[PDB]
Amino acid sequence: TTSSALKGAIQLGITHSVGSLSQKPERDVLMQDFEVVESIFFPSQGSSSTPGHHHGDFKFKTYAPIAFRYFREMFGIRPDDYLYSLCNEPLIELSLFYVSSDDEFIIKTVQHKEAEFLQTLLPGYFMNLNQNMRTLLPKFYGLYCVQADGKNIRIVVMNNLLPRAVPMHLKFALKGSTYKRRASPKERSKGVPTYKDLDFMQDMPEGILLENDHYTALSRTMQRDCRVLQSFKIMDYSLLVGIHILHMGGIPAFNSKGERLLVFIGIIDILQSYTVSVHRPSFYADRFQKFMCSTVFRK
Amino acid sequence: TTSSALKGAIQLGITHSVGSLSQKPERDVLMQDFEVVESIFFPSQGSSSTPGHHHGDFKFKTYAPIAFRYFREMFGIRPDDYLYSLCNEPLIELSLFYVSSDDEFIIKTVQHKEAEFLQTLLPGYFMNLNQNMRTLLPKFYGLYCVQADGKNIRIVVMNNLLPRAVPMHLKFALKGSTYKRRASPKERSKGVPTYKDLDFMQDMPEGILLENDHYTALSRTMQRDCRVLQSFKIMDYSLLVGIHILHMGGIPAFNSKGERLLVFIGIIDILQSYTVSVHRPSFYADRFQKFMCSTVFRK
């Protein structure tokens, strides 16, 4: 299990990266700061700025640091809370995946293509964050790379929509398409499984209700994230919806002859670099939206 | 005087450009919207969307429209107020310069190099506006081009720091350098002339005082606009300072054994595309700042 030697390099290097940054004084972000990549070397022998460790020698690459300082702040992620949740508490595997012990932060691994894509994406992302506070896209806290025995492991640190904190009764993974949009039998016999579009259309035919106030905003900030997504020629993103039926940081929703319930939603799998027509991601987004905003949620 | 045939094309075309835009529904800005250029043709014979006119036929090019919609809004420029001040009231020459009759809006002409530079500049500008509300840079309301008898006249519409509205007793044009920084005799015998750095250093040796509250902000948001300016490899910008000694939208300042007074400041001549060293605009900015923040204004 080199999994435990990654975990280590991850925790160690982030601390050096963000720890070093917090002593440095704060300053606005500039277009320059998005292309920045900074590395630091971690010998197992330890260095002058660097502790030894039982993991093999490795270099730790932290991408666009000032940009993510800024993003984390814009999300309400205090530096010490970030550093604690990630570096001072066991990381937790899953099934090339990790979670903080406190279940607030995800750490997925990404192909060099996905990563570099995200790098180019940062300006649009900035511009979204500052005009749509309500946006549903992934919250990217950080992009790092670990250089160990020739390999490059490349990670994105980001928010967990659906934390153990609250228990979820239904998982839904939506897209606005239908083909093979049914939860595999294998999936269908999990605890709370992630059902797909065909599942939602039978098992919740009356939909999800919302108050004409709460609704128009969701409709509004999805029209927005989609117009943003298409612009970047992205497709195959899904709208994850977690439902808690009630007996507090989400959306209050009703139920077709059902208990009041709180839904927890957000868009995923956004790093999809784009043979497809020029007019097609536009299409994917219109479908998506009109679906979520007419079949999944209703006023 | 084709000056009056420009004035016309300007007023006519803006109205069509912004007038058309205001019917269109509003939406966030995207990186895409900064490269956008849109044109429209104005025959003297008039068209289906286009009135006739006694100016020679011309095409009206409006650069990055959604971006400036957004900027104007971010500055508090209502569309109808913009359109009135510019298009429904005589423009006013000066000495390739114009002002609105109401003296709020400047219209300078710019070389194809300056204009295209500004086009590339828009992302950094956006990113500045959203992190430094207090920034002193030019306020760019719009970039347009008029195509008449082969020529391209290219205009920037922007804010007048120093409007007739308030009467100014001293003009100062600062830079942090000294060589040939003296108001020409010719200039020195104008009404209120624009004195330069050597002038300020003798005629106001005790400086300008401010309250430790008011000061630190100016210092702060200049360190910011300079760090921004250098990043874009700009130099030769000046800090225009208007002083009104008092017997209300500016800065309250004292005077070395003098009446309380209100200063009105902001940075100019920022479209300066950059043989100079890579380390030099950095230098220009540090000088500039330490000057304005140690010789011109004191706590």
A76 and A131, same structural domain? yes
Torsion angles phi and psi, residue B97, rounded to 5: -160, 155
B223 and B147, same structural domain? no
Would you say A207 and A263 are in contact if contact means Cβ atoms under 8 Å apart? no
B286 and B215, same structural domain? yes
Would you say B30 and B57 are in contact if contact means Cβ atoms under 8 Å apart? no
A166 and A149, same structural domain? no
Cβ neighbour number for residue B99 with a 10 Å cutoff: 19
B236 and B213, same structural domain? yes
B230 part of contact set with chain A, CB < 8 Å: no
Structure tokens at A244: 């808690």
Distance CA(A138)–CA(A267), nearest Å, equals 6
Task: Determine the distance from the C-alpha atom of residue A101 to the mean position of all C-alpha atoms in its chain, rounded to a whole number.
Answer: 17
- Residue B274 sits in a domain whose CATH number is 3.30.810.10
Question: Into how many domains does chain A fold?
Answer: 2
A148 and A187, same structural domain? no
Torsion angles phi and psi, residue A176, rounded to 5: 85, 0
Q: B194: burial class by Cβ within 10 Å (0-12, 13-18, 19+)?
A: buried
A227 part of contact set with chain B, CB < 8 Å: yes
B195 and B61, same structural domain? no
Pick the last residue of a domain from A112, A137, A160: A160
B63 and B175, same structural domain? no
A152 lies in which domain range? Answer: 1-160
B150 and B4, same structural domain? yes
Structure tokens at A50: 């660097």
Distance (Å) of CA B181 to CA A102, A232, B207, B298: 62, 49, 17, 21
Identify which of B28, B131, B228 has the shortest CB distance to residue A131: B28
Identify which of A28, A31, A228 has the shortest CB distance to residue B123: A31
Q: Measured between CA atoms, how close is B232 to chain A, in angstroms?
A: 9
Report how this structure was experimentally obtained: X-ray
Largest CA distance in chain A: 66
Pick the last residue of a domain from B160, B187, B204: B160
Structure tokens at B45: 């014979």
Task: List the alpha helices (DSSP H) in chain B.
Answer: 3-23, 32-35, 65-75, 79-87, 112-129, 185-188, 197-203, 212-231, 280-291
Distance CA(B243)–CA(B188), nearest Å, equals 17
A87 and A61, same structural domain? yes
Which residues make beta-bridge pairs with B72? Answer: none
Pick the last residue of a domain from A144, A160, A176: A160
B51 and B76, same structural domain? yes
Q: Measured between CA atoms, how close is B220 to chain A, in angstroms?
A: 10
B295 and B190, same structural domain? yes
- Residue B135 sits in a domain whose CATH number is 3.30.800.10
Q: What residues in A contact B30, CB-CB < 8 Å?
A: 124, 127, 227-228, 231
